[PDB]
Design a protein around this nucleic acid. Structure first.
Ligand SMILES: [Mg+2]
Lengths: 1129, 657
DNA sequence: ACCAGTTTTTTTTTTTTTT
DNA sequence: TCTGGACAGAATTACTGGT
DNA sequence: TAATTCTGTCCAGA
């Protein structure tokens, strides 16, 4: 068993590729040609289940293994990930079968030695409890003796107890207790082994000890190069797995890894559940500890920590500044709930904006009706800033030492050096997921960056009196730093090649699937897609495998309405010696009045479906998919359903067997094989009552065919097993994700869903903010569902569920000559809206859509409102910060970047990566109408056709054409690259950018050009008074400072500005000038007030119009007057 | 004949048939003192029920402390206690209604009393059984109408015995295997008690939600029809009860238009005054005040929020719930009332401003505004909107209950307040003792209604003639034409049970191409199997509203498919007994119901009110006192508006005492 | 205007890992 | 074990379209 | 201290 076994192997000899194999392979070749090797990519693969999807995935995996072997001979980690453990085990077993049984041209592809070598390269990584319980007592004894750990009495005693329990733990409760004990024992034992291996007593592993350890720790085989293929669940993949040295997190090491994800769309929910688990942190304590410990511990002059202290110096500065400004030394005293998406959404449970004041004599900070929101927002930014710095520091610590054991070593060393051990967990769970962030410089929450919720997350803060000491409060904050789509995008950016294999992998729903609009914008060419030709090839393959029409298989779809009289007659026959069907339903079926109407409707639909099924002569196997389990808790309804089934069986003379509690637990304990056995051995029909959740991926409803019982109804539909031939589809319900790990986890899940809908454009910012507010105050599940049902994302999710069900019901090639699909009439409207390309739809889904017989327009309005609101609030905050001194260094650059972007690209062809919030998709190409008070509520804006007579954003409304026509400003614009005209593209700047920034920037640039044409020159305003005045004017012969301000219509604070400028910079002259206007009105002079005076007594000179808009002539007389007034002193 | 009511016109019992079928006994204690006989009646009945095959027993006249006992024809009463006087009796010796009650109690066995199960609720976890909600049928004398008889249909609940000592020692009721009836049993593991005194179980008076006969059967009136069937089943024609119809003279109806005009007139009068909103709660949820203001805003009334009451303005004081306070000193409402003793203002709790769904409740706001207007009219002692002329020269009086809660308050004299209309101004005063003595003398036998018991009713008095008028709730319930409604519902039930062949729909489309129902029928058929007849549920979207739809449904009826019909049209008049305001001058009875069309689910019966007076013929102006649609919010009232104003005045004077 | 059929939010089951 | 009379609790204070 | 009207428990009393 060695690589030498393949020396004579022919790596060019392969099985005849199927169309699916080509569809997988050739996009990857194209990607490598386009993006090059080690790029990373996401390749959704809408393969229908049952038709060779698992075989093709495993064949691709095996081909990658063979490529690895070939490279090893001539001179990469492979992951198979899915949500379910049993699916992982089945996939691994199928890969082993494929290795053992694959044949090419009539002979086994791999020799027994090659088969053994390949099977040795594959690893399965279950949870720790199962990993321990799978190990034989011999392996554990060998491991304990080899590490001389058996001398430790606690370990030996616990292992003996586990071994004793394992031999007879058949009782489910005893089994659960054994699982918990085994998990804890595995944790302790691996901790001890890692500690022993880290020290100078490192045990040399070889022979039997090495094999035993590898059996106990497959991650050890991964680590030491013995294996490179891992089969594990998504939960284990996110959690990481242990080796002899430390815990290994695949996320931190995805460079070059190939990652096959089965049921890709389902992994969104799993990743969200993992993200929502992270603990709530008390921000006040966190910042207090950070500031105190950064003051306490200062430096160390050692080579290892080179380039580290400079990373934290800004954090030290801002920690001290924040502590001084908010007086963190004082105790905080007066629950209040604050929610924020960190960008444009800020909701609070309090009706009155709470504020913070400091009482020095009391030595306390008092919260009463400095805003509280600003305090927590600043603290959160610092807290995230600290964690982000740790990530950078840990990386740098490696480069100094030179990423898994060294990573934890670096974290521990840095925290000990700075004396911040209390944050070690926060840092670890931050680095695991958020530490994979490749868009670190891609978003600092700046407008100049690429802004999106999916790599911004959300924050939720609870303010309440501290337990044990009510004199103080604690600000417990829980947050998300990314969404599942953000995690996937970071995985692809790290270099992973991801194969998302799932029918409906592009379901077009951000709740039940990754946001593929965001993924497209974020990845570009890295998000691979199947061309029309490849999709046609896949469709042809599917039709060849499922040739319904040529074989005469008829799909009969029947939409069913509530049948009250039919149910009434059935109820009156059940308990015939009764009076009222309402009483029978209430008393005997045990249905309360609050649910009587709903139960009547869905029970009547189900019973109509069953009656139609039993009436049909040939059909034998029916599956009923409800939203609820008809288990013992509903035995009263099961009795009535059984009565109806017996009635109809006697009426139509056909035996019928009902399976009611078909459920995950029932599938585990009784097994779905009972239904298959009954169908294979017993004559008659079968009705199976299950749910969409119970019939999840991997549950195979096939049954072995016995032609004696099938009559002549079966027909082979391919160019011995059969599947469901009748199905009832209840409308999927409860389509909003929920988390039961904890209350805060559920809150994070709900807010993530709301913000994802707002980001996708499915909710207007007004509706999104209202929903966030209602959620914060504690709205009911039913009201959340009502809010969700208004979006088209809900309909997309419902269609996804229906498609998944019908696809999962069609796993064989033997079909009955008629297939009965019964559908709740509530699905008719939803399915009639299906408008996607039907090339990859299954026959059942196509029939469903035909029998029924997310608007980009809606998204455009919502996204225009969202971008305008984000721009408005971001610019307001940025200007407010610019009116503060210390933050000027970065905010000035942000301001200049925004202005330069708008001047240079007023309109762009493609959705920008950066500055994406500066623009909206106009729907009118280069212009658009809008209404809204830019100084008022951003939620009130309306755009495009909704306001035909509203204000317009266009090249005409800014007078750029009249400005850059025959003047000195055109050379200025051409030299600096500014746009002399608006290209008529789809993306146009938002109203806020047009009105508050672009039009002022044009005036500033025009004034600068015109004045520089007359020997003037300018320098940047000092940070103390930045953005209060445009520029500082320098002219020969004048020593007094001169300030310029180009703003129209006073866009009384001018006197305050003048006083503030003069008190610092002494006496000065001020220039007020409008770039465009008319020369007809005289120049004016003023003295720190709107009242004018004589020229020499005035310090403020107003030039009403530097340029005549009628023909763009330069008002040279005004310039000469200005020069004379300057020289007069 | 007029609207139907629970008042019994006649009870027909064949006393000879009863004697041929049952044996009756009279029982009373012999020799025991009347002070101790109550102490042994605790056992008397149980001993009688332990004696043998006793069907049931019914109390006689209270003065006798006796019982009438019913046993089979061949059985004989045998009580081991010799201290009891026993006497075989003939059925003819009993009052007809008492024998009827005995027979009713015996229906469960022939086929404490007769209970029909209507609705059950499963108990919470850790418990088994049902909470049974039943309709009890029993006769009761009508004290207001000379001991005429009424047929009660009260709701009464049963719970498992398993779910105090008194609860353990109660009639161990039992439910039937069929579940049609609930009857007393020795070890029947059921007690006639709900979970709390709260969450009172109720049963709809009528229910025709979807013209569903089965849902109609589960209302009080459906149970009444079933009881009328069971009476004939048990006794055929030998026993029968006929419900009396109130003779109809005048039956005013009330459309939404009239009420809307009245309320726009009302709101306009309030637009001329200043309104203020206050909040005296500790944890001030100012959102309550904001919601109140916004609700008032939708009515276009100038309102504002102030931190304290303002004299001379219409102030609404949002105050904390009284249940959170242990004494009047802790209540801000009473504290401010004691201070602001000469200003009109209203109060309400913050929670009432939103409905169960959380939406703002506008009925609360409108009721607050109407109460403010009424209080302002009392304060200014002049009408601000048009009130129809009342009787001339009359004086209104209203006894007020003292604050004491002891049982002796039943007989204590009470303070009495009076109001009078002179010209246009309303005079309000506290009645002098001489006036009260004169009124008591004049009322004669009716004085007990005004000066005895806790139920002291206001009285209209005519000093110039001594005439009076008292408005008494008789307790009689007005019933719709439930026999006819039940017949129609059964006809619809039979018709809707048959699926309509597609042939008839095609024939209709052929025959009436101009009909606009065809646009719907073609779509329905295209979305249906050409081989299967259409069940009625497919046509449900085709409402019985337009003329063409009515013609289509009538045409289907001629084919034998009776699917939809008119039930609540005024021509039918089934629901007259629960609509508008009905009044009869000659006999002085009246009742009030709803406005507009009857809602499909009516939860209550309008009571019949009796005006007791001394006139040979009641003055016509008395009718005018009820044409007021804001005393009872947006509905006809059963109380004269002068009494509403006088009650408001009496309430205002509480803090001036 | 008036008079009589229509009418009312949503509607769970399931999973993995580490403690 | 009957029974009726207080005494708080519960529902109702529509909606909408066709004529 | 939403108001009115109807009504379900409940308890003492005859
Ligand atoms: Mg009041």
């Amino acid at each position: 068993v060695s690589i030498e076994e393949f020396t004579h192997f022919d790596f060019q000899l392969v099985p005849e590729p199927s169309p699916l194999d080509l569809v997988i392979t050739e996009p990857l070749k194209n990607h490598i040609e386009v993006n090059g090797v080690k790029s990373g990519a996401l390749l959704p693969l809408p393969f229908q289940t049952g038709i060779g999807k698992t075989y093709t995935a495993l064949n691709f995996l095996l081909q990658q293994m063979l490529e690895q072997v070939r490279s090893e001979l001539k001179e990469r980690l492979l992951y198979y990930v899915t949500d379910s453990v049993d699916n992982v085990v089945s996939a691994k077993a199928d890969l082993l079968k494929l290795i053992e049984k694959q044949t090419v041209k009539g002979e086994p592809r791999f020799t027994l030695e090659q088969q053994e070598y390949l099977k040795a390269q594959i690893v399965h990584l279950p949870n720790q409890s199962e990993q321990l319980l799978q190990c034989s007592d011999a392996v554990l004894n060998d491991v304990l003796i080899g590490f001389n750990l058996n001398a430790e009495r606690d370990v030996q005693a616990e292992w003996s107890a586990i071994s004793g329990l394992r031999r007879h733990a058949s009782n489910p409760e005893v089994k659960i207790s054994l699982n918990r004990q085994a998990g804890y024992f595995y944790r302790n034992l691996i901790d001890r082994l890692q500690k022993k291996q880290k020290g100078a007593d490192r045990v040399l592993l070889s022979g039997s000890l090495l094999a035993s350890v590898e059996t106990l720790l497959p991650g050890e085989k991964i680590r030491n190069g013995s294996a490179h293929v891992a089969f594990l669940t998504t939960s284990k993949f996110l959690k990481g797995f242990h080796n002899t040295r430390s815990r290994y997190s695949p996320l931190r090491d995805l460079s070059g890894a190939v990652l096959i994800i089965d049921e890709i769309d389902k992994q969104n929910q799993v990743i969200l559940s993992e993200l929502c688990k992270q603990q709530a942190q008390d921000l006040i304590w966190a910042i207090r500890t950070l500031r105190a410990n950064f003051r306490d511990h200062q430096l160390e002059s050692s080579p290892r920590y080179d380039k580290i202290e400079d990373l934290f110096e800004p954090l030290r500065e801002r920690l001290e500044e924040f502590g001084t400004n908010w007086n963190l030394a004082f105790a905080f005293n007066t629950p209040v709930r604050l929610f924020s998406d960190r960008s444009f959404t800020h909701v609070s449970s309090a009706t009155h904006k709470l504020s913070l004041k400091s009482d020095f004599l009391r030595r306390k900070n008092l919260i009463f009706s400095g805003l509280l929101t600003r305090f927590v927002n600043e603290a959160d930014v610092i807290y995230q800033w600290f964690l982000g710095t740790m990530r950078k520091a840990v990386f740098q610590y490696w480069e100094n030492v030179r990423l898994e054991g060294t990573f934890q070593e670096a974290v521990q060393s840095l925290l000990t050096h700075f004396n911040l051990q209390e944050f070690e967990s926060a840092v670890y769970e931050s680095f695991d997921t958020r530490g994979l962030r490749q868009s670190a410089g891609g978003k600092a929450n700046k407008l100049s960056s690429s802004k999106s919720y999916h790599h911004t997350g959300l924050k939720l803060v609870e303010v309440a009196h501290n337990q044990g000491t009510r004199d103080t409060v604690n600000c417990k904050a829980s947050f998300l730093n990314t969404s599942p789509s953000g995690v996937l995008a970071d995985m692809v950016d790290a270099g992973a090649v991801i194969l998302g294999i799932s029918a409906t992998a592009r379901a077009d729903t951000v709740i039940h699937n990754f946001d593929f609009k965001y993924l497209n914008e974020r990845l570009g060419n890295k998000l691979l897609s199947l061309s029309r030709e490849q999709k046609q090839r896949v469709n042809n393959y599917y039709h060849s495998r499922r040739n319904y029409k040529d074989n005469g298989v008829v799909l009969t779809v029947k939409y069913l309405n509530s049948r009250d009289a039919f149910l009434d007659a059935l109820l009156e026959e059940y308990k015939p010696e009764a009076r009222s069907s309402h009483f029978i339903l209430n008393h005997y079926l045990g249905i309360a009045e609050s649910e009587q109407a709903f139960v009547r409707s869905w029970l009547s639909k189900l019973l109509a479906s069953i009656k139609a099924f039993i009436s049909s002569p040939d059909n034998r196997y029916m599956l009923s998919l409800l939203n609820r389990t008809l288990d013992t808790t509903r035995q009263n309804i099961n009795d009535f359903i059984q009565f109806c089934c017996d009635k109809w069986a006697k009426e139509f003379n056909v035996k019928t067997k009902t399976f009611f509690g078909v459920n995950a637990d029932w599938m585990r304990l009784v097994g779905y094989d009972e239904i298959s056995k009954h169908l294979n051995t017993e004559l008659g029909k079968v009705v199976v009552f299950s749910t969409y959740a119970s019939m999840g991926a991997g549950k195979n409803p096939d049954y072995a065919v016995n032609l004696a019982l099938e009559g002549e109804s079966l027909i082979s539909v391919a160019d011995l097993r059969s599947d469901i031939d009748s199905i009832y589809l209840e409308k999927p319900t409860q389509l909003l994700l929920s988390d039961d790990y904890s209350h805060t986890a559920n809150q994070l899940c709900q807010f993530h869903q709301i913000l994802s809908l707002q980001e996708n454009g499915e909710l207007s910012p007004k509706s999104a903010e209202n929903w966030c507010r209602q959620q914060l105050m504690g709205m009911s599940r039913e009201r959340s569902l009502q809010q969700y049902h208004q979006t088209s994302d809900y309909q997309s999710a419902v269609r996804k569920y229906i498609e998944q069900a019908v696809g999962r019901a069609g796993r064989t090639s033997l079909k009955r000559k008629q297939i009965l699909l019964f559908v709740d009439s509530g699905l008719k409207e939803i399915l009639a809206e299906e408008s996607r390309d039907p090339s990859l739809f299954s026959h059942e889904y196509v029939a469903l859509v035909n029998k029924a017989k997310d608007r980009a327009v809606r998204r455009l309005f919502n996204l225009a409102q969202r971008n305008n609101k984000d721009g408005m609030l971001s610019i307001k905050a940025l200007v407010h910060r610019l009116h503060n001194q210390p933050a000027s260094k970065s905010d000035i650059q942000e301001w200049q970047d925004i202005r330069t972007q708008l001047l240079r690209y007023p309109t762009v062809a493609f959705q920008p990566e950066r500055f994406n919030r500066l623009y909206l998709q106009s729907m009118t190409k280069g212009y658009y109408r809008y209404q809204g008070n830019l100084d008022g509520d951003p939620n009130s804006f309306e755009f495009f056709d909704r306001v035909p007579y509203g204000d317009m954003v266009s090249e005409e409304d800014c007078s750029l054409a009249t400005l850059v026509q025959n003047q000195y400003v055109r050379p200025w614009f051409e030299r600096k690259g500014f746009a002399c005209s608006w290209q008529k593209e789809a993306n146009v700047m938002t109203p806020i950018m047009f009105t508050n920034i672009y039009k002022g920037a044009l005036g500033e640039q025009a004034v600068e050009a015109v004045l520089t044409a007359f020997d003037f020159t300018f320098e940047e305003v000092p940070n103390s008074i930045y953005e209060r005045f445009d520029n500082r004017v320098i002219f020969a012969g004048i020593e007094q400072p001169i300030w310029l301000d180009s703003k129209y219509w006073k866009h009384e604070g001018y006197s305050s500005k003048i006083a503030l400028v003069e008190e610092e910079f002494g006496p000065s002259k001020f220039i007020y000038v409008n770039a465009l206007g008319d020369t007809s009105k005289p120049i004016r002079y003023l003295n720190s007030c709107f009242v004018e005076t004589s020229p020499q007594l005035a310090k403020v000179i107003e030039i009403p119009a530097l340029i005549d808009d009628s023909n763009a002539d330069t008002n040279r007389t005004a310039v000469q007057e200005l020069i004379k007034w300057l020289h007069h002193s | 004949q007029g609207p139907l009511s629970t008042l019994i016109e006649q009870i027909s019992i064949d006393t000879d048939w009863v004697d041929r079928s049952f044996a009756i006994y009279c029982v009373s204690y012999k020799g025991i003192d009347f002070s101790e006989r109550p102490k042994r009646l605790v056992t008397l009945a149980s001993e009688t029920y332990k004696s043998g095959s006793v069907y049931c027993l019914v109390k006689g006249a209270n003065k006798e402390a006796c019982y009438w006992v019913l046993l089979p024809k061949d059985s004989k009463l045998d009580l081991k206690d010799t201290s009891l006087a026993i006497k075989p009796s003939s059925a003819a010796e009993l009052p007809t209604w008492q024998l009827a009650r005995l027979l009713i109690k015996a229906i469960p066995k022939v086929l404490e009393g007769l209970y029909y199960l209507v609705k059950s609720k499963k108990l919470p976890k850790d418990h088994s059984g049902y909470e049974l909600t039943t309709v009890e049928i029993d006769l009761a004398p009508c004290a207001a109408l000379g001991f005429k008889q009424t047929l009660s249909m009260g709701t009464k609940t049963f719970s498992p015995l398993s779910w105090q000592k008194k609860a353990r020692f109660a009639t161990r009721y039992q439910l039937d295997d069929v579940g049609k009836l609930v009857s007393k049993s020795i070890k029947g593991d059921y007690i006639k008690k709900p979970l709390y005194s709260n969450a009172k179980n109720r049963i709809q008076a009528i229910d025709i939600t979807k013209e569903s006969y089965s849902g109609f059967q589960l209302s009080k009136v459906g149970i009444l029809e079933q009881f009328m069937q069971d009476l004939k089943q048990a006794y055929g024609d030998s026993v029968s009860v006929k419900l009396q119809r109130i003779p109809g003279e005048k039956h005013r109806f009330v459309s939404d238009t009239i009420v809307k005009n009245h309320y726009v007139g009302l709101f306009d009068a309030l637009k001329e005054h200043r309104l203020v909103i206050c909040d005296l709660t500790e944890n001030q949820d100012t959102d309550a005040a904001l919601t109140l203001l916004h609700g008032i805003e939708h009515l276009d009334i100038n309102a504002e929020i102030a931190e304290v009451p303002i004299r001379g303005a219409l102030n609404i004081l949002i105050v904390g719930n009284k249940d959170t306070y242990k004494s009047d000193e802790e209540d801000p409402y009473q504290v401010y009332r004691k201070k602001y003793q000469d200003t009109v203002f209203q109060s309400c709790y913050p929670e009432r401003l939103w409905n169960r769904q959380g939406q703002p409740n506008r009925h609360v706001v409108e009721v607050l505004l109407k109460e403010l207007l009424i209080k302002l009219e009392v304060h200014t002692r002049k009408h601000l909107i048009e009130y129809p002329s009342g009787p001339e020269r009359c004086v209104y009086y209203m006894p007020q209950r003292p604050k004491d809660e002891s049982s002796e308050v039943r007989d204590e004299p009470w303070p009495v307040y009076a109001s009078k209309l002179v010209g246009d101004e309303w005079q309000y005063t506290q009645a002098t003792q001489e006036e009260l003595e004169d009124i008591e003398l004049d009322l004669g036998n009716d004085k007990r209604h005004v000066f005895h018991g806790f139920e002291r009713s206001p009285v209209i008095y005519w000093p110039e003639t001594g005439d009076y008028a008292i408005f008494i709730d008789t307790g009689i319930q007005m019933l719709p034409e439930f026999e006819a409604v039940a017949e129609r519902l059964r006809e619809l039930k039979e018709g809707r049970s048959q699926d309509v062949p597609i042939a008839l729909l095609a024939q209709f489309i052929e025959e009436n191409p101009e009909s606009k129902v065809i646009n719907k029928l073609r779509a329905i058929l295209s979305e249906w199997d050409d081989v299967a007849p259409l069940p009625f549920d497919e046509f449900s979207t085709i409402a019985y509203k337009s003329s063409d739809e009515k013609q289509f449904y009538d045409w289907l009826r001629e084919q034998g498919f009776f699917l939809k019909t008119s039930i609540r049209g005024q021509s039918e008049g089934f629901f007259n007994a629960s609509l508008g305001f009905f009044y009869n001058r000659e006999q002085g009875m009246y009742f009030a119901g709803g406005k507009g069309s009857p809602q499909s689910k009516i939860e209550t019966f309008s009571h019949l009110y009796l005006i007791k007076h001394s006139f040979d013929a009641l003055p016509e102006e008395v009718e005018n006192l009820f044409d007021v649609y804001h005393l009872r919010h947006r509905l006809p009232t059963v109380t004269p508006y002068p009494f509403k104003h006088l009650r408001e005045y009496v309430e205002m004077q509480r803090f001036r005492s």
